[PDB]
RNA sequence: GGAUGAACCGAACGCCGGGUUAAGGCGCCCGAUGCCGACGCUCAUCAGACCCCAGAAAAGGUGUUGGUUGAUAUAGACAGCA
RNA sequence: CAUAGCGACGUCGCUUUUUGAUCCUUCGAUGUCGGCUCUUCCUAUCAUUGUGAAGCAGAAUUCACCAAGCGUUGGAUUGUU
RNA sequence: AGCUACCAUCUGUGGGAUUAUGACUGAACGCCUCUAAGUCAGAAUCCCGCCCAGGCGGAACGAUACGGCAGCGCCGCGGAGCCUCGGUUGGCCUCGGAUAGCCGGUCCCCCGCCGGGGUCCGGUGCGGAGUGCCCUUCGUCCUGGGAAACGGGGCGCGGCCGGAGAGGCGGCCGCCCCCUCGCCCGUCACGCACCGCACGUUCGUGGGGAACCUGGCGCUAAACCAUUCGUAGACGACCUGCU
């Protein structure tokens, strides 16, 4: 069964504009510019009005599998809007039983070094994705603050940090040490 | 039974008269066959299954094609049938949109063969009827109930791929 | 035909283009294929890589030197693919096989000439848009071909010079259209003749 | 002054998969890629022109190296514009993939 | 059936063409990866195996049993008279691989270097490069040479210098010099071309290329052993004494 | 993205099939593949027709779906499809192709001579414009 | 013809020309679909591809496509949050 | 506590590394056990590289997956397998 | 001396896509979700490098045969001719690319007067179209009207530039000599008009091999055997040396 037409409309706030070059979405907000293309999905994108800036995603004659792509595109567009308007701040808490985790935020927050993870002499060097800034929270003793515009890049850096401190050859249920994402939040809280 | 473009047949037959009933009752059936000979054969098969009749034991008194009474009108067809799958017999109800009843039956045959590997000899069509748009239950058919239907032809595949076989310009599929 | 048939391999499917070429060389026709790294193969990249690795595994166990000569260059791969569709163990097949030339990128003998494109082998029309495909250049690069970067750089230079040539030709065509505008009182007599018989809408 | 004959290619003999009828041959007329377009070329004289080592007599000219095997196209073949030709002598197999002229001699138009 | 016990294979499959080397010198087959960042430097040199001896030194390896101790290590003496660079080859990258673009030979080729071009130096007229060297004097020839240099500058990717040894400095019978292409690395193409041009007809002492206490790679052709059996060629196991048709063979 | 749609009253051009080279109006939509098709003024009686042999145009009529021949014919004649279509570039390109195909040998000869002279004059003007544009020298 | 095969499918044979076919085929090998073939299903990181025949079972899949039966629902379903 | 790890009652397969059944080839001969030597291959993986699970606290162990690159030995007895 | 031993000593290497698996975003299924689309990490596996050999595969360069009549190379399309191998029967001298979009032109911003951007105007069953474009061969003689006359022809010379991935190619100046001829529509007659007949019509001065004459410009060498070596070796082959 091919559904004749499946569409969903995403509203754009007044402080941010979106420009389309075919299926390449250019989103320029106050926090910066995010650009992402969708050439791998054969859908129709159009801007509706000059008043409220409605964006519609259209797919004509789609089977069950490709109909799921419309809302995926809509969610990605909303994530880009949220990033360029409010931004993405991920809070990760480092937990430990005996050995405290020493975290060094190197130049511009692009490099993170972990010293005493489980007391081993190795040093973990994790480089953040470009455009993502990592920092140590000034309000908490063990908290890492990751800030950036693109949700995928920020969460990818967070996943790299989380997987970097991985216990090996031990019962991970008992040995719960490592750095783990506490919450996924925003910047500027607006 | 092979296929083609099927045709409706109003087949009327009866038993041979006997010195027990001089006027055996007549029976009328609608049979969709590529030709009238296959229509007669399927009529004999169906009357043998339902009543206690044989082709030799009886006769066929009428066999004519049933033309569509409104082939210029789009209409919804509801079809009841049974078929023998690889693991038994099941009953189905399917819906189609076509101008002709016979074309709708042919569409049903092709669809059953495509979806369930059902060969034509295994399928017993038991009821064909035009239905209103309100009585349709299959969403693939119901979605065509639009007084303002509108859709483009998104990605048109080039069909004249060999005239020319060699060319300088890459084809355009946007129209 | 009598001339050399130049085919651009970009966006073309392997099997279809190979079959068309093999049918062409059998007819006593000279065929040259350029930019063989632009050939697409249906199916996702991992499956085709597994296929080529399975091809790599097939070797003469006693003496791999005599074994199947796995060619790694994309043009050589396409050449072997065409050889699979020909009676290459006969004189007729070899004579046909000598009429085919394959190259990675576009050589200077052919970069200054126009390139044909076969509709029956294009990925855009012979493949459903929702499917996945594999580039011959990337597949060759990860299996043992060694000259992907230099090929890309030379294609970049060729694209630069071709863009210059295209801008020159656009200037020439603009000047030609301007010239058509300048003279029409001395042209309209023949213009009406041409427009009468279909030419020059 | 002009080419004055259509270009055709000796594609091969009429044949099965494991049988070869050499008494008749299949030709590919350039630009004719459909069966319905083969009507114009049916019955037309077709010639195979080649050179050899010894001089042969030439009608209306001095002897030269040119030799001709005459024939004529009988009927259409296949659906892709293939045609069949019966020659006075069976075509040598070295001519496969070479030029065959369609002489337009029996004009019906 | 399976062999009753497993055992590692005799010999290596990475040296299967166990044949006499087609060359007596020993070619490089891979020069170090070039970067423009480094200064201009040669990547290879030629030497002659003079002999072997042993030395006494003190080791400065902490954590070792021999730390701050005296050791005796065998060393090999390689006499290396300075090379004489006599030409420049420029290579260009192709999808078919590296190929020789243009070659320029310097004037006044050394007499020992000219001996390489002749199988029979005794019967030669010594005419090698006689007409070539005349193009280093005429203005048209120098214009041709400058045009070749500019072509190498604007087209070639890697350049190599032809250098020859000095038999007259060595106690060997052979007076025939050894020619070799040596890659010039560490800079832009123009810089290395000019640097090679400033070293034509000059001597490159071995210190300018290799330094103290650095580790290098040695390329050469091993000692010939003639025709050898499997016992010495592959170090296979000798068959027992009771074997009839021979014990220095491979049984299966 | 899309400017042309399949809808009731949309005028479509027949590419191939029995009715090739004719203008028709879509009446109703059938099973994503066929459509009720009517040319009342282009001599195309009402019949089913696959979408694959259709090439859509920019003329859209305004009649209810599944209406009879009368209303469709009136909607065709009012705001005449024939005259407006004949002025389009598409129809005149088709006409030019048809008359080029039916051109005889004498017409080919005349066209060859006319194109010879026209191209020579155009090339002379091009050379004049090149030499007029070649006298440029400014810091 | 089934690549190939004593038995399978067709069909049995003097030597040839023309025509038409069987079984089987018509991307190239290799003659024929270079039909603007029709309808639908199917993505496989061991896909699938034709009697005999040359490779598979039970049991599963919230992959997808149909179909049967039942149930809830503006007297507000279902799913989420409390 | 069915399913960490096992699996009675039943039941479906795979292998030709066992032993059976047959006699299709070989009876104008294909040298028949075992050992030594040597090469390659398979994976239903003993260890090693990387993982998942446990009645995995650590250690040690078990179960399972990607996996056949590398290795799987020295001896007393017996002609032995 | 030589050979030789974990019976002495030295040396043994880098990268990519990734499996399993663990994750991110994220629907399908207003929740979830490593998966559907798109992403990340990832290994004794795989591939490549290093290493070993080097194609009926290529590159660049060197020197290319005498002191006697003696061989050779290039330049002339120079000539007269031979032998042999046959194919073919106008050319197109080039954007990149996308296909749920393209292509052209133009007014403003920014990079060396040309390009990249932002507007605006057009075309899109592609007509600035390969279903396409260019040229097009009967030739001459009167003979007018138009096109042109800032025009073409030079195997005419000299100079310059661009092209290196296989440049084997292309473009531009200066001088000199021609005709005002060739392009269209007209006038005027002529040519073997070979009496119906085929291989005619081109690439083409085609490719290759010997040979003669005709002129000019230039060159005067290696290889192998033998011998010697022993870094080599069954013999070959290999590394050498020889007023
Ligand atoms: C009594 O034991 C034998 O039969 C072995 C032998 O006699 C060996 C003789 C070999 C010579 C060289 C003498 O022909 C023999 O005739 O070999 C036969 C042999 O003659 C060559 C034939 C067999 C048949 C096929 C293979 N050949 C393989 C060896 C063999 C082994 C046997 C066997 C028969 C064969 C035969 O029975 C039990 O084990
Ligand atoms: Mg073992
Ligand atoms: Mg003995
Ligand atoms: Mg048979
Ligand atoms: Mg078979
Ligand atoms: Mg017959
Ligand atoms: Mg076949
Ligand atoms: Mg064929
Ligand atoms: Mg024997
Ligand atoms: Mg034997
Ligand atoms: Mg396994
Ligand atoms: Mg443990
Ligand atoms: Mg190994
Ligand atoms: Mg040792
Ligand atoms: Mg979410
Ligand atoms: Mg995964
Ligand atoms: Mg990765």
**CB count in 10 Å sphere of residue B40:** 18
Strands C100-102 and C30-34 come out as: parallel
For chain B, list the contacting chains (3+ Cβ pairs, <8 Å): A, C, D, F
Per-residue tokens: E246: 């021979």
**CB count in 10 Å sphere of residue A190:** 8
Per the CB < 8 A criterion, the answer to whether C8 and B167 are in contact is no
- Total CB pairs under 8 A between chain C and E: 12
State how far residue A67 is from chain F, nearest Cα, in angstroms.
17
Strand partners, E87: E105, E162
Contacts of C151 in chain E (CB under 8 A): 95
Length of chain C: 201
State how far residue B154 is from chain C, nearest Cα, in angstroms.
11
Q: After which residues does chain E show a gap where C to N exceeds 2.5 Å?
A: none
Report in angstroms the alpha-carbon separations of B82 from B45, B92, B108, B118, B123. Answer: 15, 6, 12, 11, 6
- Total CB pairs under 8 A between chain A and C: 4
Contacts of C116 in chain B (CB under 8 A): 166-168
CA F20 to mean position of chain CA atoms: 12
Query: Is any atom of nucleic acid chain H found less than 7 Å from the CB of residue A97?
Result: no
Per the CB < 8 A criterion, the answer to whether F72 and F64 are in contact is no
Q: Residue E239: which nucleotide is closest by CA–C1'?
A: H37
Strand partners, B21: B18
Which residues sit with Cβ closer than 5 angstroms to ligand 3, an ion?
E 244
Closest CA relative to residue A46, chosen from A23, A27, A68: A23
Give the integer Cα–Cα distance in Å for E81 and B148: 95
Block residue for tokens 């058919």: B141
Strand order through the sheet with A32-37:
A17-21, A24-29, A32-37
Give the integer Cα–Cα distance in Å for B106 and B111: 9
Chain-chain contact of A66 with C129 (C-beta, under 8 angstroms): no
Strand partners, B76: B97, B131
Residue D55, SS3 per DSSP: strand
**CB count in 10 Å sphere of residue B152:** 21
Query: How many degrees, rounded to 5, is the angle at CA A76 between CA A72 and CA A78?
Result: 115
Which stretches does DSSP call E strand in chain B?
7-15, 27-33, 58-65, 75-85, 88-98, 123-131
Per the CB < 8 A criterion, the answer to whether F111 and F103 are in contact is yes
Per the CB < 8 A criterion, the answer to whether A155 and A145 are in contact is no
- Asked if C193 has any chain F CB less than 8 Å from its own CB, the reply is yes
Strand partners, E182: E161
Q: How far is the CA of A120 from the centre of ligand 12 (A)?
A: 18
Block residue for tokens 């040669």: E42
User: Which bases of strand I have any atom within 7 Å of the beta carbon of a protein residue?
Assistant: 3-6, 9-10, 16-19, 22-28, 36-41, 46-54, 57-64, 84-102, 104-106, 113-115, 118, 123-138, 146-152, 163-168, 183-185, 197-201, 220-226, 229, 231-234, 237-243
Per-residue tokens: C73: 């260059």
Partner residue opposite A60 with nearest CB, options B139, B140, B152: B152
- Asked if C43 has any chain B CB less than 8 Å from its own CB, the reply is no
Length of chain A: 190
Residue E49, SS3 per DSSP: strand
Count of CA atoms in the C-beta half-sphere (13 A) of A84: 23
Q: Containing H/E element for A156?
A: helix A151-164
The conformation of residue E61, written as its DSSP 8-state character, comes to: -
Strand partners, D62: none
Closest CA relative to residue C40, chosen from C147, C157, C118: C118
Chain-chain contact of F32 with A2 (C-beta, under 8 angstroms): yes
Please provide residue E137's backbone torsions phi and psi, each rounded to the nearest 5 degrees. Answer: -115, -50
Residue C72 burial class via C-beta count within 10 angstroms: exposed 0-12, middle 13-18, buried 19 and up: middle
Residues of F1-13 as b/e, b for ≥16 C-beta within 10 angstroms?
A: eeeeebbbbbbbb
Block residue for tokens 């060389």: C25
Closest CA relative to residue F57, chosen from F28, F98, F27, F89: F89
Per the CB < 8 A criterion, the answer to whether D74 and D8 are in contact is no
Query: Is any atom of nucleic acid chain H found less than 7 Å from the CB of residue A171?
Result: yes
State how far residue F6 is from chain A, nearest Cα, in angstroms.
12
Give the integer Cα–Cα distance in Å for A68 and A6: 10
Give the integer Cα–Cα distance in Å for A31 and A41: 28
């Amino acid at each position: 069964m091919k559904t004749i037409l499946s569409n969903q409309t995403v509203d754009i706030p007044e402080n941010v504009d979106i420009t389309l070059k075919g299926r390449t979405v250019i989103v320029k907000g106050p926090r910066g510019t995010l650009r992402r293309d969708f050439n791998h999905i054969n859908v129709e994108l159009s801007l509706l009005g000059k008043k409220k800036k409605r964006l519609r995603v259209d797919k004509w004659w789609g089977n069950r599998k490709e109909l799921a792509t419309v809302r995926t595109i809509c969610s990605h567009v909303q994530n880009m809007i949220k990033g360029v308007t409010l931004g993405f701040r991920y809070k990760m808490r480092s937990v430990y039983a005996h050995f405290p985790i020493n975290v060094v935020i190197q130049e511009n927050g692009s490099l993170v070094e972990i010293r005493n993870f489980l007391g081993e002499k190795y040093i973990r060097r994790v480089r953040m994705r470009p455009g993502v800034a990592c920092s140590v929270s000034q309000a908490q003793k063990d908290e890492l603050i990751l800030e950036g515009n693109d949700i995928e890049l920020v969460s990818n850096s967070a996943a790299l940090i989380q997987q970097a401190t991985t216990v090996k050859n031990k019962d991970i249920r008992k040995f719960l040490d490592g750095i783990y994402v506490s919450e996924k939040g925003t910047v500027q809280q607006a | 039974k092979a296929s083609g473009t099927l045709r409706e047949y109003k087949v009327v037959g009866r038993c041979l008269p006997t010195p027990k009933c001089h006027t055996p009752p007549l029976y009328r059936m609608r049979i969709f066959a590529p030709n009238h000979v296959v229509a007669k054969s399927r009529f004999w098969y169906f009357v043998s299954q339902l009543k206690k009749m044989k082709k030799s034991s009886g006769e066929i008194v009428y066999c004519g094609q049933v033309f569509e009474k409104s082939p210029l009108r789009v209409k919804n067809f509801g079809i009841w049938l049974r078929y023998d799958s690889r693991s038994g017999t099941h009953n189905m109800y399917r819906e189609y949109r076509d101008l002709t009843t016979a074309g709708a039956v042919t569409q049903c045959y092709r669809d059953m063969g495509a979806r369930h590997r059902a060969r034509a000899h295994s399928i017993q069509i038991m009821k064909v009827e035009e239905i209103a748009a309100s009585k349709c239950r299959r969403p693939a058919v119901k979605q065509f109930h639009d007084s303002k239907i509108k859709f483009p032809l998104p990605h048109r595949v080039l069909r004249r791929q060999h005239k020319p076989r060699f060319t300088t310009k890459r084809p355009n599929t946007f129209f | 035909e009598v001339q050399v048939l130049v085919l651009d391999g970009r966006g073309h499917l392997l099997g279809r283009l190979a079959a068309i070429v093999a049918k062409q060389v059998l007819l006593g026709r000279k065929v040259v294929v350029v930019r063989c790294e632009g050939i697409n193969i249906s199916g996702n990249f991992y499956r085709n890589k597994l296929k080529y690795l399975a091809f790599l595994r097939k070797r003469m166990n006693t003496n791999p030197s005599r074994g199947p000569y796995h060619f790694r260059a994309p043009s050589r791969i396409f050449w072997r693919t065409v050889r699979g569709m020909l009676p290459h163990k006969t004189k007729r097949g070899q004579a046909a096989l000598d009429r085919l030339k394959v190259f990675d990128g576009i050589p200077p003998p052919y970069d200054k000439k126009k390139r044909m494109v076969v509709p029956a082998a294009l990925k855009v029309v012979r493949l459903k848009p929702t499917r996945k495909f594999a580039y011959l250049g990337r597949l060759a690069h990860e299996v043992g071909w060694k000259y992907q970067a230099v090929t890309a750089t030379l294609e970049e230079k060729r694209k630069e010079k071709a863009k210059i040539h295209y801008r020159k030709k656009k200037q020439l065509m603009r000047l030609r259209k301007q010239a058509e505008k300048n003279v029409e009182k001395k042209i309209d007599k023949y213009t009406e003749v041409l427009k009468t018989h279909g030419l020059l809408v | 002054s002009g080419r004055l004959w259509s270009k055709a290619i000796f594609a091969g003999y009429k044949r099965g998969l494991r049988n070869q009828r050499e008494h008749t041959a299949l030709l590919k007329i350039e630009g004719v890629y459909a069966r319905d377009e083969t009507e114009f070329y049916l019955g037309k004289r077709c010639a195979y022109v080649y050179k050899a080592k010894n001089n042969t007599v030439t009608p209306g000219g001095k002897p030269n190296k040119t030799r001709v095997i005459w024939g004529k196209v009988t009927r259409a073949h296949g659906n892709s514009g293939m045609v069949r030709a019966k020659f006075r002598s069976n075509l040598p197999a070295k001519a496969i993939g070479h030029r065959i002229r369609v002489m337009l001699y029996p004009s019906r138009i | 059936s399976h062999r009753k016990f497993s055992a590692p294979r005799h010999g290596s499959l990475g040296f299967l063409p166990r044949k006499r080397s087609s060359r007596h010198r020993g070619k490089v087959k891979s020069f170090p990866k070039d970067d423009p960042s480094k200064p201009v430097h040669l990547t290879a040199f030629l030497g002659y195996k003079a002999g072997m001896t042993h030395i006494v030194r003190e080791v400065d390896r902490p954590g070792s049993k021999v730390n701050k101790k005296e050791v005796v290590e065998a060393v090999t003496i390689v006499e290396t008279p300075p090379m004489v660079v006599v030409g420049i080859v420029g290579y260009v990258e192709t999808p078919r691989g590296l190929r020789t673009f243009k070659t320029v030979f310097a004037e006044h080729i050394s007499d020992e270097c000219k001996r390489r071009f002749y199988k029979n130096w005794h019967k030669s007229k010594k005419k090698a490069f006689t007409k070539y060297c005349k193009k280093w004097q005429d203005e048209d020839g120098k214009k041709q040479l400058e045009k070749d240099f500019s072509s190498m500058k604007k087209y070639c990717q890697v350049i190599r210098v032809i250098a020859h040894t000095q038999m007259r400095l060595l106690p060997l019978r052979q007076k025939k010099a050894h020619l070799m292409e040596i890659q010039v690395n560490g800079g832009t193409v123009a810089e290395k071309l000019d640097w090679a041009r400033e070293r034509l007809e000059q001597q490159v002492p071995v210190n300018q290329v290799f330094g103290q206490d650095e580790m290098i790679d040695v390329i050469g052709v091993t000692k010939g052993k003639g025709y050898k059996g499997v016992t010495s060629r592959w170090h296979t196991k000798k068959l027992p004494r009771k074997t009839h048709r021979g014990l220095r063979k491979v049984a299966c | 993205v899309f400017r042309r749609f399949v809808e009731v009253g949309r005028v479509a051009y027949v590419s191939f099939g029995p009715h090739a080279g004719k203008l028709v109006a879509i009446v109703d939509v059938i099973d994503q593949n066929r459509a009720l098709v009517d040319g009342p003024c282009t001599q195309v009686r009402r019949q089913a027709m696959p979408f694959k042999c259709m090439q859509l145009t920019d003329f859209i009529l305004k009649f209810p779906h599944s209406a009879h021949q009368k209303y469709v014919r009136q909607a065709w004649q009012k705001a005449d499809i024939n005259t407006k279509w004949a002025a389009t570039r598409w129809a005149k390109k088709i006409e030019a192709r048809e008359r080029k195909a039916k051109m005889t040998d004498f017409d080919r000869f005349k066209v060859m001579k006319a194109k010879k002279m026209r191209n020579r004059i155009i090339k002379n003007e091009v050379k004049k414009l090149q030499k007029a544009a070649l006298l440029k020298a400014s810091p």
